[PDB]
């Protein structure tokens, strides 16, 4: 199950947003435009599969297909592309606002029944499963007055109908943020605009669930668990192929050539070998593939190993989050509810032979019960399950000389304890993004609209400790009781 998320944004046209908010600051129109650049960038950098359409109401002209009065669409339900961003961004500020108004409409009345009408009819046209659906609003009206109470009541009925349908309403204050001046009676028909503005960048999410793994703890019992890859790098957008000016990719006829015939290597004519001493030891890719067969894809459990005996010096591939499940074998999660309840003998690690893929050797792994740290705000921290650390082999070692050469004086430990105690970090995990990847993103948006570069910054990986030293006190230099400086 994947689904989708349909998002539509509506703006009135009554000069209540074409106005400058009685300030040199951004207009409600302009702040909505910056919000929509933020939304479009966020959608592009995240899964862009979601469709976004542009529709405006309260307008002198009509280009909605239904052609009801005071409704003017611009964009169909499409993934936000570069051209969409340019065509919406060409209409902002005073000059963009006025040209947009003369090509769209400078402002007129609202017909709520008509707009709910057209939204239901349009959302009918979706041809795919819809995981979520939401409509965000940004309008200054406290409550419907211009429309008669008949239109307000029928809009209330349709609003209840759509709320039961699944779609929900969102709004923010416009006349004055904070307090309560908006939705006094929209309280019945039912900062934060900054979050709708540009706040979060380089987003991505996954709704998948890795395959059912079969615990081969013994020949008699094989059980079903759900593995889950919970950590991996986010990658570089692919250099998909193109052309100088026609802007068109290339295929490939990549095949190794043979001096004998004008043709290429035949799959027989290509033949594997290796120089061992005086031998071109002769094999094929088939033989090398056949060599690596050890046993079936799965975990061939050697057995439990008391986790009370454990070490931190060894390190390997980042861990894998296994989870209890009952997919194709019964009683699975019945016994999976066990082994997470005791930390005296059920915390015991599981030294296991684990083959992840067909035709793969067994790889040593160990189990850690990761108790659902269900955060107090319900945010199940360290979700309920298993942290799996892959165990070393006898080639994870390059020998090191002994460095136990000194155990220095207590004066040095005291001074550097004083030094380091003045700095402690709450360990915010999200505190540093990828500056390299974000800089590549910035190169992309530079090539997007017109910029030589839109943003020239680091993701805060640069050392602020040039100001921490005085914050900690320059005493770090006077706590050098060292007679000779190391860096000379």
């Amino acid at each position: 199950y994947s689904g989708r998320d349909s998002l539509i944004f509506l703006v009135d046209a009554s000069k209540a947003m074409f106005e400058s908010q009685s300030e040199d600051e951004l207009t409600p129109f302009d702040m909505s435009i910056q919000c929509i650049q933020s939304v479009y960038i966020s959608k592009i950098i995240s899964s862009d599969r979601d469709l976004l359409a542009v529709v405006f109401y309260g307008t002198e002209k009509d280009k909605n297909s239904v052609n009801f009065k005071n409704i003017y669409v611009l964009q169909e339900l499409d993934n936000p592309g570069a051209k969409r961003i340019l065509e919406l961004d060409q209409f902002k500020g005073q000059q963009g606002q006025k040209r947009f108004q003369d090509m769209m409409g400078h402002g007129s009345d609202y017909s709520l029944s008509e707009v709910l009408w057209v939204c239901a009819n349009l959302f009918s046209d979706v041809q795919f499963k819809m995981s979520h659906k939401r409509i965000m609003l940004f309008t200054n009206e406290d409550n419907p007055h211009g429309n008669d109470s008949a239109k307000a009541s029928r809009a209330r009925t349709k609003a209840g109908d759509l709320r039961d349908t699944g779609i929900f309403l969102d709004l923010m204050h416009l006349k004055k943020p904070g307090g309560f001046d908006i939705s006094l009676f929209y309280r019945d028909i039912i900062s934060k605009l900054e979050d709708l503005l540009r706040k979060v960048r380089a987003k991505e999410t996954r709704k998948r669930a890795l395959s059912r793994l079969k615990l081969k703890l013994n020949k008699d019992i094989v059980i079903s668990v759900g593995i889950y890859n919970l950590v991996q790098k986010a990658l570089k957008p692919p250099p998909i192929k193109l052309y100088r000016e026609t802007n068109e990719p290339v295929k490939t006829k990549t095949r190794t050539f043979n001096t004998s015939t004008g043709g290429l290597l035949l799959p027989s004519d290509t033949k594997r070998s290796q120089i061992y001493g005086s031998r071109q030891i002769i094999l094929e890719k088939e033989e090398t593939e056949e060599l690596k067969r050890f046993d079936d894809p799965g975990l061939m459990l050697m057995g439990f190993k008391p986790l009370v005996l454990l070490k931190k010096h060894h390190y390997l591939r980042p861990s894998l989050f296994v989870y209890p499940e009952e997919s194709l074998v019964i009683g699975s999660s019945t016994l999976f509810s066990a082994l997470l309840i005791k930390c005296l003998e059920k915390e015991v690690a599981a030294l296991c032979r684990y083959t992840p893929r067909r035709n793969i050797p067994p790889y040593f792994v160990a189990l850690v019960p990761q108790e659902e740290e269900l955060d107090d705000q319900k945010i199940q921290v360290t979700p309920p399950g298993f942290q799996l650390v892959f165990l070393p082999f006898a080639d994870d070692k390059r020998k090191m000389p002994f460095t136990e050469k000194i155990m220095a004086t207590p004066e040095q430990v005291g001074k550097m304890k004083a030094i380091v105690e003045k700095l402690r970090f709450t360990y915010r995990s999200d505190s540093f993004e990828n500056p390299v990847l974000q800089q590549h993103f910035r190169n992309l948006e530079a090539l997007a609209l017109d910029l030589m570069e839109p943003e020239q910054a680091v993701d805060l990986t640069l050392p602020k400790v040039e100001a921490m030293n005085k914050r900690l006190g320059s005493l770090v230099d006077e706590f050098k009781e060292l007679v000779y400086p190391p860096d000379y």
Partner: peptide, 23 residues
């Protein structure tokens, strides 16, 4: 339930970066 990302409900509303703190 609250605490879910507005763009992708079911995944968490992650607070933005805050850098390193000095205590």
């Amino acid at each position: 339930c609250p605490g879910e990302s507005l763009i992708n409900p079911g995944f968490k509303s992650k607070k933005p970066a805050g850098g390193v703190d000095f205590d």
